[PDB]
Paper text:
One group of metal ion efflux transporters that regulates metal ion homeostasis and can be found in all domains of life is the Cation Diffusion Facilitator (CDF) protein family. One of the most highly conserved and abundant integral MM proteins is the CDF transporter MamM. MamM was recently proposed to function as a magnetosome-directed iron transporter required for iron biomineralization since its deletion abolished magnetite biomineralization and mutation of residues within the conserved TMD metal-binding site resulted in alterations of magnetite crystal size, morphology and even mineral phase. To summarize our results we present an alternative model for the CDF CTD mode of action, in which we propose that upon metal cation binding, the CTD induces conformational changes towards a tighter and more compact fold which allows the activation of iron transport through the TMD.
Examining this closed state model, three putative binding sites were revealed, in which Asp, Glu and His residues from the two monomers are brought into close proximity and may bind divalent cations. The central binding site is presumed to be the main site as it displays tight packing and contains two symmetry-related His285 and two Asp249 residues. Compared to transcomplementation with the wild-type allele, single point mutations of the histidine residues at the putative central binding site (H285A) or periphery binding sites (H264A) affected neither Cmag values nor the number, size and morphology of the crystals. The D249A, H285A and H264A mutants displayed a minor increase in the number of binding sites compared to the wild-type protein, which may be the result of an increased void volume that allowed the accommodation of additional cations after amino acid substitution to alanine. Fourth, we confirmed metal coordination by the His264 and His285 residues by ssNMR. To confirm that these observed phenotypic differences are due to true transport function alternations, we also examined the expression levels of all MamM mutants, their ability to stabilize MamB expression, performed MD simulations for dimer stability evaluation and determined their CTD structures. (ii) All mutants exhibited an apo-MamM CTD-like behavior along the MD simulations, and (iii) an absence of structural differences was observed.
Author numbering:
A (entry chain A), B (entry chain A): 213 to 292
Amino acid sequence: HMEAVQNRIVEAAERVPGVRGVIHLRARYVGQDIWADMIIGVDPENTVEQAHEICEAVQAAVCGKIRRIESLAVSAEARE
Amino acid sequence: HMEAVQNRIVEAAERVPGVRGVIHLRARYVGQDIWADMIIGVDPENTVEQAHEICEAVQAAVCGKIRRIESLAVSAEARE
């Protein structure tokens, strides 16, 4: 339900080039809308700029696929 | 007072190689202890691993200089 929506968020994030898994996802309803914050893994040898580009790509992929999301923050952490 | 402690935190962070300013600092007292979270700027062309190393260096510099800090989280963002 919410679990259904979280699964969709993870799946959509994992399909973006450069994502090394979803490390963390917190999602909540504000009325009928979802507000979420997530942390993605990235290659430690990517540049900070590349990691920012991946996060922005995730934000666009996820919000394009899951139309109820009205706020999404995406950060990155090194992951082997 | 608290302003004195914040100034010390910023100064100590700015003295670590690789810091391109303090972007954000939130500090609060939990009893006599300080708990703080901060965001440092870094070179967009540093690797994610390098940025992690800078953040860890900041955590060590700051907590070494300001002994009342009992919790400090340090994250990075690209800054030109």
